[PDB]
Design a protein around this nucleic acid. Sequence first.
RNA 1: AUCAGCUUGUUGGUGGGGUGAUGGCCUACCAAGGCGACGACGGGUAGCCGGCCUGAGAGGGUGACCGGCCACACUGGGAC
RNA 2: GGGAGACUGGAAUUCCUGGUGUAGCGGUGGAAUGCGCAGAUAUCAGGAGGAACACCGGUGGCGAAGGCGGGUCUCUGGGCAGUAACUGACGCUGAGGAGCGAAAGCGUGGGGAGCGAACAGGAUUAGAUACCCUGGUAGUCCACGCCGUAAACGGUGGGUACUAGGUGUGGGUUUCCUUCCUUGGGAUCCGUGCCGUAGCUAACGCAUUAAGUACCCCGCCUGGGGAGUACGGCCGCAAGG
RNA 3: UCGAAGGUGGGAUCGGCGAUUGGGACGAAGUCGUAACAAGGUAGCCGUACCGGAAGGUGCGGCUGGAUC
RNA 4: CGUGUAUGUGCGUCCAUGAUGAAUCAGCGGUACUAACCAUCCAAAACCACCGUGACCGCACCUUUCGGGGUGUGGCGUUG
RNA 5: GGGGACCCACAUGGCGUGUAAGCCUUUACGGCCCAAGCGUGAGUGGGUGGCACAAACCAGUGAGAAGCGACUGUUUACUA
Lengths: 275, 88, 96
Amino acid sequence: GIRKYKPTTPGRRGASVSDFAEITRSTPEKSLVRPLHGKGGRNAHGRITTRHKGGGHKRAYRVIDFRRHDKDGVNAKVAHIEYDPNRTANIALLHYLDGEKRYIIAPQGLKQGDVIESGANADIKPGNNLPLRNIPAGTVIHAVELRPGGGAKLARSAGVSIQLLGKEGTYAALRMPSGEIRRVDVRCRATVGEVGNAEQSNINWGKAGRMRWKGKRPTVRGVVMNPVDHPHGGGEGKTSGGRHPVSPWGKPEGRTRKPNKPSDKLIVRRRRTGK
Amino acid sequence: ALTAEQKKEILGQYGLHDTDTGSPEAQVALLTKRIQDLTEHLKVHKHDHHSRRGLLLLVGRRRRLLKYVAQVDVARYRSLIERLGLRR
Amino acid sequence: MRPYEIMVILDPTLDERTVAPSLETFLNVIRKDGGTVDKVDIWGRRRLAYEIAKHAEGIYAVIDVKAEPATVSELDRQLNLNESVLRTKVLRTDKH
RNA sequence: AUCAGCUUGUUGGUGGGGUGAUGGCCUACCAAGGCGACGACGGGUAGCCGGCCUGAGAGGGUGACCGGCCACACUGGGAC
RNA sequence: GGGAGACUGGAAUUCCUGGUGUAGCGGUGGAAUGCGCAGAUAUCAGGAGGAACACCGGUGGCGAAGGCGGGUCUCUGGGCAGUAACUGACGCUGAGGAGCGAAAGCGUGGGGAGCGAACAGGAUUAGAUACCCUGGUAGUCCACGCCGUAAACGGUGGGUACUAGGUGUGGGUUUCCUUCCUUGGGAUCCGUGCCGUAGCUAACGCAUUAAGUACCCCGCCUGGGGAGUACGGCCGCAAGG
RNA sequence: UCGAAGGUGGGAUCGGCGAUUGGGACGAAGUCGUAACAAGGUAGCCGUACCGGAAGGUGCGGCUGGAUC
RNA sequence: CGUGUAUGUGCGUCCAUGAUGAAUCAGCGGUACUAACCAUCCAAAACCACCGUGACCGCACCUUUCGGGGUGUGGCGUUG
RNA sequence: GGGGACCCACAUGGCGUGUAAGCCUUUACGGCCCAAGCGUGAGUGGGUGGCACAAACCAGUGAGAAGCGACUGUUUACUA
Ligand SMILES: [Mg+2]
Ligand SMILES: [Mg+2]
Ligand SMILES: [Mg+2]
Ligand SMILES: [Mg+2]
Ligand SMILES: [Mg+2]
Ligand SMILES: [Mg+2]
Ligand SMILES: [Mg+2]
Ligand SMILES: [Mg+2]
Ligand SMILES: [Mg+2]
Ligand SMILES: [Mg+2]
Ligand SMILES: [Mg+2]
Ligand SMILES: [Mg+2]
Ligand SMILES: [Mg+2]
Ligand SMILES: [Mg+2]
Ligand SMILES: [Mg+2]
Ligand SMILES: [Mg+2]
Ligand SMILES: [Mg+2]
Ligand SMILES: [Mg+2]
Ligand SMILES: [Mg+2]
Ligand SMILES: [Mg+2]
Ligand SMILES: [Mg+2]
Ligand SMILES: [Mg+2]
Ligand SMILES: [Mg+2]
Ligand SMILES: [Mg+2]
Ligand SMILES: [Mg+2]
Ligand SMILES: [Mg+2]
Ligand SMILES: [Mg+2]
Ligand SMILES: [Mg+2]
Ligand SMILES: [Mg+2]
Ligand SMILES: [Mg+2]
Ligand SMILES: [Mg+2]
Ligand SMILES: [Mg+2]
Ligand SMILES: [Mg+2]
Ligand SMILES: [Mg+2]
Ligand SMILES: [Mg+2]
Ligand SMILES: [Mg+2]
Ligand SMILES: [Mg+2]
Ligand SMILES: [Mg+2]
Ligand SMILES: [Mg+2]
Ligand SMILES: [Mg+2]
Ligand SMILES: [Mg+2]
Ligand SMILES: [Mg+2]
Ligand SMILES: [Mg+2]
Ligand SMILES: [Mg+2]
Ligand SMILES: [Mg+2]
Ligand SMILES: [Mg+2]
Ligand SMILES: [Mg+2]
Ligand SMILES: [Mg+2]
Ligand SMILES: [Mg+2]
Ligand SMILES: [Mg+2]
Ligand SMILES: [Mg+2]
Ligand SMILES: [Mg+2]
Ligand SMILES: [Mg+2]
Ligand SMILES: [Mg+2]
Ligand SMILES: [Mg+2]
Ligand SMILES: [Mg+2]
Ligand SMILES: [Mg+2]
Ligand SMILES: [Mg+2]
Ligand SMILES: [Mg+2]
Ligand SMILES: [Mg+2]
Ligand SMILES: [Mg+2]
Ligand SMILES: [Mg+2]
Ligand SMILES: [Mg+2]
Ligand SMILES: [Mg+2]
Ligand SMILES: [Mg+2]
Ligand SMILES: [Mg+2]
Ligand SMILES: [Mg+2]
Ligand SMILES: [Mg+2]
Ligand SMILES: [Mg+2]
Ligand SMILES: [Mg+2]
Ligand SMILES: [Mg+2]
Ligand SMILES: [Mg+2]
Ligand SMILES: [Mg+2]
Ligand SMILES: [Mg+2]
Ligand SMILES: [Mg+2]
Ligand SMILES: [Mg+2]
Ligand SMILES: [Mg+2]
Ligand SMILES: [Mg+2]
Ligand SMILES: [Mg+2]
Ligand SMILES: [Mg+2]
Ligand SMILES: [Mg+2]
Ligand SMILES: [Mg+2]
């Protein structure tokens, strides 16, 4: 759950963490690890592509079976629900009957011992990936794909995931966490159940070291920025810039969504906030 | 709530004889089985205050019965508490 | 091991003959688990009070069940998942 | 209790000194407890009693005089 | 309708989408701020989301008290009648202590249809920082914690024994006119309304569900303000208690 | 060794005073007001939160020590 | 670490022991293709009885001086 | 605020280590203890010297208020 840390030092007074009692193994599988490195917020070209992030704690990579489609009709027990920091959620390894173990996203309330099926015959216990032909309308879903068989991309937020609304014709309607409705094929791949670590939103950061570890760099406010560096720069004292806030990269607040996407016709309306 | 099968099993198995039912031994046995079972239930169901009232009432009743057993005979009290494995 | 009353309403798009195989296949899970006893009677094609699921009529089937709460809950979970069924419930035949 | 914990010779035993007399009265060595909500330790007031006044009684108030003790002798100590 | 979790239903409001359909719709003691001519109101079809369950529903049931009611499942407490098998002084109340607790309020993270403090306008008045109208932010909903106060009333602590009745309701045992249908008649215990003796009370009034006549223990009061306030102590992150 | 007086240093209690401020009561009489007592012209009161020179107003929940029908 | 000598343990290809395994002909899953039997619920081609009366034919009363119209019954027909 | 140096006694004391030897066995590069040997702090008494016994070097000044900034952090290399 959530465990709050006692104030031993003035720095870690407010630090509270979601204790990971949901851990079973501590040393990740060495076979599936691929060579990875912190890119430092920089491309191969050497320029800093995005500031406020980079540096920190070098970490490893592991392949997740996001698009599980190659093998079907075989069951798998939950091997060990381990901790992968490269995601907000957790990964629970599976012993499939063919002996080919792949990592998958651990759904909410998953504990070691449940049997998971991936295919048409799969039931409604969480972790079962199956096309929309075999799912009731109205069930909460996660790790949702966009086409019948091109790899799953969406619905992997910890705690709130996409909810299926209804099927009409050959197009299916999906409700977004933002409260929006997206039209998607009735043959895409989607799983059942919410994603775990819902209590992760109750994490309290704590200090700056954790944050350089996590990746982000300290944020430099524009009002003290130099005027050449930023439109908010300059001033003798504290000033807001004398104009509406603007990213120093030229454009102010506003529309950024370029229309006319191939899935733009597959969207009914855009998000509305604070209702 | 206990039903006929296990309840008659308990009353006989902790009974002094095959006919007596209201003996303090059988009474404490029924109270203990009830409290462990329904405490297991309340480990899942948290905010059942109306049932925690039953917990407290049955526990005070139990405490009175155990006090009576200790008063009437130390040996039987010790035998009962040792056979059920509790603290007091 | 308590007597239960269940009624199932099916979509009228299915013919009357298929109901019996469908219901017996549905309740085979209880038949094979607890060694239970059942009774089945059928009457359908009644005009509904209002539109339900954009439908105007249906078929009624009532079964008397002497089984386990786990078994009846399993039947409910397996059956309400079906799309051809509309509305179902389970009650207690005894005092409670 | 608009005072909840107090105490370290403090508590208990043994061995020594001590005093007219027993005794942590004093010393050494052993153990950790005694007193505590049937009001401890703290705070304010005040010499106690036979008596006096009041009240049918219960009770309340009080310690003039006398008398039975207690404590002091400008303040604090000590000893022959 | 005792409590908790889950699943599920319909009506209604609002919003969105698409027809039809035209210059008004909403409003009060009267009118104007409000939305319309960019197509409102009205009305039909569909969808979305949130809250709460009209009739049954009552001076009726349960719970110790706050309180509790759309169905379904799951688990569970309390109470009642008969047989009376068994335990054989285990009973009662309970200072300090501990647990539950209307609404509002606070933190975190979600939800948020309707309603609605605060705040804007429009209206009345000499005057409105109100009563009225149009809007609507907390809150009202959910989960975890908190505060622990109400005219928290039956303004009456609990338990036991005794003391005339009449009239309704609910639950269960029996017996007899006996159709053996019948609130038929009778006996019994529990709960809950109304009116009434003796009695008590200063009076209103209570009257077997006592404020009657007693027993056991517990809290509270000693003229009105000051004042349920200052200081001190305890709890609470704070409001505060 | 003990030992009264004296001096070092910080904690409690009793206090006395202290600019100014907060609150209360008594004066008598004046302005601002209509609060409550009759359905006091918005039924009252209680708990609570917000608001306003002021009595008060509103929201939510509770009682009738509320009158008609 | 890396190249060679050859003798000693010593092994099959060209003999053949072992372990097995697999691509061929002849039919069956009381389940249960097709005329029924026993038990149960409902109703399409309206028979009997009552009631409501699109509309029609009218008997008696009320109503404006008579007219419209309203009230009870009969003969069907059944908006239903 | 108190003690801190040296010597003696308590003390052939306590502690660690561990030989000979002893105990044992799945017998070995084996477990238990361990006289002897080695190392060893701590305290209480008695006495002694100096002005001064953490005497050298090394090695926090403390307390009371109020302003800003929550704190650790980074910067005007070469005036802050
Ligand atoms: Mg912090
Ligand atoms: Mg990798
Ligand atoms: Mg280049
Ligand atoms: Mg950034
Ligand atoms: Mg680096
Ligand atoms: Mg993580
Ligand atoms: Mg910034
Ligand atoms: Mg700057
Ligand atoms: Mg510029
Ligand atoms: Mg530059
Ligand atoms: Mg500047
Ligand atoms: Mg300036
Ligand atoms: Mg802007
Ligand atoms: Mg959106
Ligand atoms: Mg029960
Ligand atoms: Mg002695
Ligand atoms: Mg002696
Ligand atoms: Mg002595
Ligand atoms: Mg001695
Ligand atoms: Mg006397
Ligand atoms: Mg008297
Ligand atoms: Mg008297
Ligand atoms: Mg006296
Ligand atoms: Mg004398
Ligand atoms: Mg004497
Ligand atoms: Mg003297
Ligand atoms: Mg003296
Ligand atoms: Mg719950
Ligand atoms: Mg429309
Ligand atoms: Mg509409
Ligand atoms: Mg909403
Ligand atoms: Mg007997
Ligand atoms: Mg009792
Ligand atoms: Mg008691
Ligand atoms: Mg008691
Ligand atoms: Mg007490
Ligand atoms: Mg008490
Ligand atoms: Mg508690
Ligand atoms: Mg608590
Ligand atoms: Mg509320
Ligand atoms: Mg609340
Ligand atoms: Mg607040
Ligand atoms: Mg909160
Ligand atoms: Mg929030
Ligand atoms: Mg509103
Ligand atoms: Mg309002
Ligand atoms: Mg505005
Ligand atoms: Mg206003
Ligand atoms: Mg009170
Ligand atoms: Mg109440
Ligand atoms: Mg009471
Ligand atoms: Mg009583
Ligand atoms: Mg009675
Ligand atoms: Mg009388
Ligand atoms: Mg009288
Ligand atoms: Mg009476
Ligand atoms: Mg009574
Ligand atoms: Mg009285
Ligand atoms: Mg006053
Ligand atoms: Mg008072
Ligand atoms: Mg104080
Ligand atoms: Mg003072
Ligand atoms: Mg002063
Ligand atoms: Mg005046
Ligand atoms: Mg008034
Ligand atoms: Mg007025
Ligand atoms: Mg009023
Ligand atoms: Mg009022
Ligand atoms: Mg109030
Ligand atoms: Mg208001
Ligand atoms: Mg209210
Ligand atoms: Mg009154
Ligand atoms: Mg050795
Ligand atoms: Mg040996
Ligand atoms: Mg051995
Ligand atoms: Mg010297
Ligand atoms: Mg620093
Ligand atoms: Mg810094
Ligand atoms: Mg620099
Ligand atoms: Mg510089
Ligand atoms: Mg520099
Ligand atoms: Mg400088």
